[PDB]
Each structure stands twice: as structure tokens, then as C-alpha cells.
Amino acid sequence: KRYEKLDFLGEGQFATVYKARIVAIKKKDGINRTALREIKLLQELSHPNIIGLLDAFGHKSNISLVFDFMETDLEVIIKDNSLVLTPSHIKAYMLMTLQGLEYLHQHWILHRDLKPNNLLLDENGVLKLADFGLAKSFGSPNRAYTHQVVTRWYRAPELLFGARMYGVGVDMWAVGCILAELLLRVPFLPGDSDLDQLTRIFETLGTPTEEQWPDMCSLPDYVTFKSFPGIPLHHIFSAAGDDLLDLIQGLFLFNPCARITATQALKMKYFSNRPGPTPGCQLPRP
Amino acid sequence: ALYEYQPLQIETYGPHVPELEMLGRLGYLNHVRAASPQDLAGGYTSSLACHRALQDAFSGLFWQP
Amino acid sequence: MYHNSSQKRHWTFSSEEQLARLRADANRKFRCKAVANGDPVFLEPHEEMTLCKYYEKRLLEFCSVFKPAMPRSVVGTACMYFKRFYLNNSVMEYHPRIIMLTCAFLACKVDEFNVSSPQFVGNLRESPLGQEKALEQILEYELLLIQQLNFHLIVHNPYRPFEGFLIDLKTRYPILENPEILRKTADDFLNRIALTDAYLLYTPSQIALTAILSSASRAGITMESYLSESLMLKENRTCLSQLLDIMKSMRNLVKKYEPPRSEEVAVLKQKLERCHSAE
Ligand SMILES: CC(C)c1cnn2c(NCc3ccccc3)cc(N[C@H]3CCCNC3)nc12
């Protein structure tokens, strides 16, 4: 092959990743379905905020995917206690995430695995959505989905109630959880199980009612919960301004249809307010 | 140093597709199956299916190899 | 989206002449490799085309009786895989009977149609040892098929554009009452279009629109106003002329298509078997 192994970047559920010459190579059923999903989706997508699939090769039943090399991810940024995350840095991260998500959604694809470790950053400060091994196309009624998608701490309540049909709302709720993580530097709703995740969501944001979530009880695993009032948003994010609180509320609307899309979120006044998003070369690095 | 929203510029090489929100007003949604209460609860609406079908119908209709 | 898809950029070709050049180049390099490894045994490109049409029919037959039912998108993707593979490969090097099954297997994976390998190979009408051998060959050829497709797995089929056009006609074209009458016949024409090389020569939207308009013309219904008024091809008259001649060329391609003949297929199959004995 035309690449020389350089380092060992880590071990995953379905593949191991190496550094090479700079690129990152991710190595009876046949070729692994996660690798095929990544190949088929990233071949049809071309956007600055979506991870670029440079090449793909293999031998027999093993397959390697060659992406661009990513410096870090949002999880390391959030967990790095020595990084001061200014509102401008947060706005820049959200802006790139939402632009990539907007492009992905116009092409009718849901990421379904949005979390800070899946939002990778390069040496130029460009945030790219990665790990499309769970990504799937949406917008067709005859497309069976799995509700057990998205990491639990970022799973949307419609998923946690077992929605097998959903739209961009899953990615938007994960984006709201990521925003809350960036603001609080800790996981927003770190539940230990599905029931605990729902309980934490309702204790922090309030138990939704029929008015906020019109068809709540129609979800297959709808758990009738106690009516907690939920902490007010300004009390949770004490340093969040009114525009940022409006964005958070839109991202955390229990109704997925009313939950703001990537385009709508981009049109919110928060992103066009002072201060502007920091340029990529000024974003904090660990 | 601010940010201003600009919509994505992608040439579809085809006829104009009506906006997602307008599909109900223009009567398109009368020719797709409505989303079930479970689908609406999950965030799935018939407007999504109608919009994707229209976009695929109009995509690259005028383009030449 | 098709308008920025790998199918449009890399697998839609200027003319049938370029397709014939690619296939003849495939034949020529196979011949060179065979003679350099160590004559009526070889088949001409037209014989390869007859065999490829026969085995595309065979792949359609395989996908139609496949349990559980494959979504029509999977079948379209598999047939597109077969056409693309044999654009740049000879049936004398890779047997179509196995390549078609590999195409179906890969298409089932790509289109998220979850079937286990035992189920897929149990669809084959073979003995259990035959089924396991076929599975082994499919696993052998999966990566080869993916490489020959240049890792371009998403295939845009004409059926979703067909549905979108039907929605648009139902909404904005009241002159055509009940566009669903056009469905079955257009479907038929669509299938005929699938037999030719049009899938490598035209956009899925163009194919769906040509099928719909052929169905309308078969019933006497004329909707030139659909393109003129509803599609608003008024400022660009050349765009309307381009569309109309694209549909005319599609209809000509369907007209000139001739199905493979059983006796010719039998003799070419025997020739292919001799070719696959050695080399
Ligand atoms: C697109 C993929 C292939 C990619 C691109 N770059 N890159 C890096 N670079 C360094 C780094 C270090 C820490 C945090 C972020 C980045 C690491 C890595 N490790 C995988 C290992 C398995 C579990 N998931 C993560 N994958 C990648």
C-alpha cells in the first residue's frame, strides 16, 4: 500500500486506528457493516465539517478506511480542566457542529452518535463530525430505525421512550447535551440506565406534559413519570445569556418536531450576537 | 468579527423544490401518507417524506454528462 | 443527493460509444493477460454483452424470489453494481454467476437490508454444501466487487424520483387527472429502461420522467405543458429541447434493445465455461 504505519491511535468496538503517511487508517458475515456504512455515506458527502474519507482498501474480508488525521475531539477539550472555554469558543464549536449537521441533514442523513468524542478537531481548528458507523439516512417511511442509538448521556427522550421513527431531533438533542457539557464541563445528564436517564432529564428540565409533547404516551416504551417541575434554565447555566438560554431551550424542547433544526438553530440570534465565534486557529487545544 | 447565516448553495440541476414548511399550504401533503402519532411523537412527519421525494424527483433533471 | 453523487460524477457516461470502448478495453486486457500467462475460446464483446444481459436477468430473478423480500432499492443497487462491474471487467475473468450474487450480497449490506449470510445463501437453489461453497465464493469476491466499483456504493435509483414526480403531478398538474393511472405502465417502461445502458447514461430523475411521459403518451395524454408551465422551462427553451431529446434517446435505447436468445446464450455459456476451465 501507499501508506506507512506511524503510530497506534486507539482500539475501537469494530476497528483499530493507526496514524500513517498524514492520515488515520481504521482497520461468514463478510466485510464489516460498520465499515461499509462509513464508506457508503462518506463517499457521497463533501463538507468542511464532515470527516473526509480519503481512501478505502483491504484484503479478502478485512477492510481499511483512510480518513484525514484529526488532532483531538471535543471530549478532551471538555475534560481538560486547564482550558478556559469562553462563550466565543463555545459558539464556534456549536457553529461548526451545526453547519456540518445542516449539510448532513440536507442530504437526509442522521449521525445518531453525536457526542464530544465524535466531534473531532484538526490542527486548523476545524470541527468535523466523525464516526458515521451509526449514521443512517432518514426521510423515508419504510426505513426501520433502532431506538437504542446515541450514547445514553446524549440520547433524546423520544429515543429513550423507544421511538423507531425520528428525524433530526435526535442529533439536535445530542447537540443540546454537548452544549450543556461545554457549559458545565461535566456530562449534563449522566444516567446509569435508561430509566435513570429519563429520570435525570425530567428532574432537571421538568416532566413534559401533553401540551409540551402532544403525543408523548404514544411512544412504545412510554414510562409514566412523576411531575417534577425541573430547574429553571438560568439556574442550571448561571452564566448563560438570554440568547444562549433561548438556543438551549430550543435544543431541549421535549417535542422533537418543535425542537429546533440545524438551520433554525443557525438562524438564531445567539450566533449573530456579539461576540462572534472564534476562528479555528484561536480555538483552545489540549 | 461576527457570524451571519447564509443558506447552503448546492446546485440541484433541476426544478425548484418548494420549501418544507410550505408543502402543507401548497397541497402536497394531501398526496403523501400522514405520519402516525408514534411518528409525530418521535419527530417524524409526512412533510419529510414528501420533501425528500420531491427533491429526488427534481434532482439533476436538466444535467448533462 | 444525486446532484452531488458519485453516480453522477463517475458512473454516468457521455454516450454508448464510451461504454463500448470501456467494455472492449476490458476484453482486450483480458486477452493480453491470458496470452501473456501461457483462438475461438475467447468471446467478442458482443458475446460478453449477451451473457451480461442474460445474467442481469438471472440476478433480477434471484432478487425477486429472495426471502425476506428485498426492497426494490436493493435490487436496483445490485443490478447497477452488475452493470458497473462488467463495464470494466470481462465475464471470462470473473464469472457472472458469482459476481451477480456478490452484487446482491453487497447491495443488501449497503442498503441496510439486514439479512444474515445463512439466509442469503439459503435463498440460492443449491445443496447445503453448494450453498456454503457459494458463500465462500461471495466472501472471496466481495472486496473485489467493492474495489471494481471504486468504493461507490450508494446508487440512486429512479423509483423515489418516480414517486416525487407522481406527487408533483397530483399537486400542480390538475389537467392530468389521477396520475396514478400512469404508474403501472410507467413502471413497465422503467423496467425496460433498466435492461438497457440508460442507467449509466442518464440521471434517475430523467429516467423516471421519461417513463412517466412514455406512459402518458401510450394513453394519449399529452403533458408538454407540465415541462413548459409546471416545470417552468420558459426562460431556457434550450433546456426544454435538451430534456425532450434526452427522453427521445431513452425511448430509442429501449426500442433498439434486443433480449438475448436462448440458443446463443447456451453456446456462449459453454464458451465461458471453457474459458473458466483455465486462464
Ligand atoms: C476518523 C478517525 C479514524 C480518526 C481521525 N483521527 N483520529 C485520531 N487522532 C488523534 C486523536 C486522539 C484523541 C482524540 C481525538 C483524536 C484518533 C482516533 N482514535 C479512535 C480510536 C478508536 C475509538 N475512537 C477514536 N481516531 C481518529
CATH of residue C205's domain is 1.10.472.10
Q: Cβ contact (<8 Å) for B57 and C164?
A: yes
Whether the Cβ atoms of residue A270 and residue A247 lie closer than 8 Å to each other: yes
The pairing of strands A62-68 and A23-26 is: antiparallel
Give the residues across from A58 on adjacent strands.
A63
Question: Do C270 and C135 have their domain in common?
Answer: yes
Residue B16 domain-assigned? Answer: no
A113 is catalytic: yes
* Whether C139 and C196 share a structural domain: no
CATH topology of domain A72-268: Transferase(Phosphotransferase); domain 1 (1.10.510)
Identical fold, A4-68 and A72-268: no
Half-sphere exposure of C85 (CA within 13 A, CB side): 33
* C151 has a chain A CB within 8 A of its CB: yes
Burial environment of residue A256 by CB neighbours within 10 A (0 to 12, 13 to 18, 19 or more): buried
Q: How many C-beta neighbours within 10 Å does residue C218 have?
A: 13
Say if residue C121 is in the same domain as residue C21: yes
Q: What's the DSSP call for residue B41?
A: H
Helix (H) / strand (E) containing A18: strand A16-20
In a domain, B36, yes or no: yes
> Is B49 within a domain?
yes
What's the CA gap between A151 and A184, in Å, rounded?
18
Domain count for chain C = 2
Mapped onto helix, strand or coil, the DSSP state of residue A221 is: coil
Label residues A34-57 b or e (16+ Cβ within 10 Å = b): bbbbbbbbbbbbebebbbebeebb
Q: Could you give the CA distance from residue C209 to residue C224 in angstroms, rounded to a whole number?
A: 12
Q: Which residues of A237-251 are buried (b: 16+ CB within 10 A; e: fewer)?
A: beebeeebbbbbebb
Same domain? For C175 and C218 the reply is yes
Q: Which residues precede gaps in chain A, with C-N > 2.5 A?
A: 21, 27
Residue having the nearest C-alpha atom to atom 7 of ligand 1: A70
Give the number of other Cβ atoms within 10 Å of residue A97's Cβ.
26
Q: A4-68 sits in which CATH class?
A: alpha beta
| Any domain includes B25 | yes
Partners of residue C230 on adjacent β-strands: none
Catalytically annotated residue among A73, A113, A171, A194: A113
Range C124-158 burial, b when 16+ CB lie within 10 A, else e: beeeeeebeebbebbbebbbebbebbebbbbbbbb
Burial B7-16 (b: 16+ CB within 10 A, else e): eeeeebbbbe
Cα A160 from Cα A175, distance rounded (Å): 16
Range of the structural domain that residue C229 is part of = 159-257
Whether the Cβ atoms of residue B57 and residue C163 lie closer than 8 Å to each other: yes
Run of H or E residues at A62: strand A62-68
C-alpha closest to that of A230 among A211, A255, A207: A207
For ligand 1, whether the C-beta of A255 sits within 6 Å is no
Q: Please name the method used to determine this structure.
A: cryo-EM
Beta carbons within 8 Å of C32's beta carbon, 6+ residues apart = none
Contacts of A164 in chain B (CB under 8 A): 38, 42
CB-nearest to B62 from C2, C163, C242 is C242
Tell me how far apart the alpha carbons of residues C227 and C224 are, in angstroms, rounded to a whole number: 6
Task: Specify if B11 maps to a domain.
Answer: no
- Cα C154 to chain centroid distance, Å, stands at 13
Q: How far is B25 from chain A (nearest CA, A)?
A: 18
Strand intervals (E) in A74-148: 109-110, 119-121, 127-129, 136-137
Q: Which three cell numbers stand for residue A211?
A: 401540551
Residue range of the domain that includes B35: 21-58
So where are chain A's domains?
4-68, 72-268
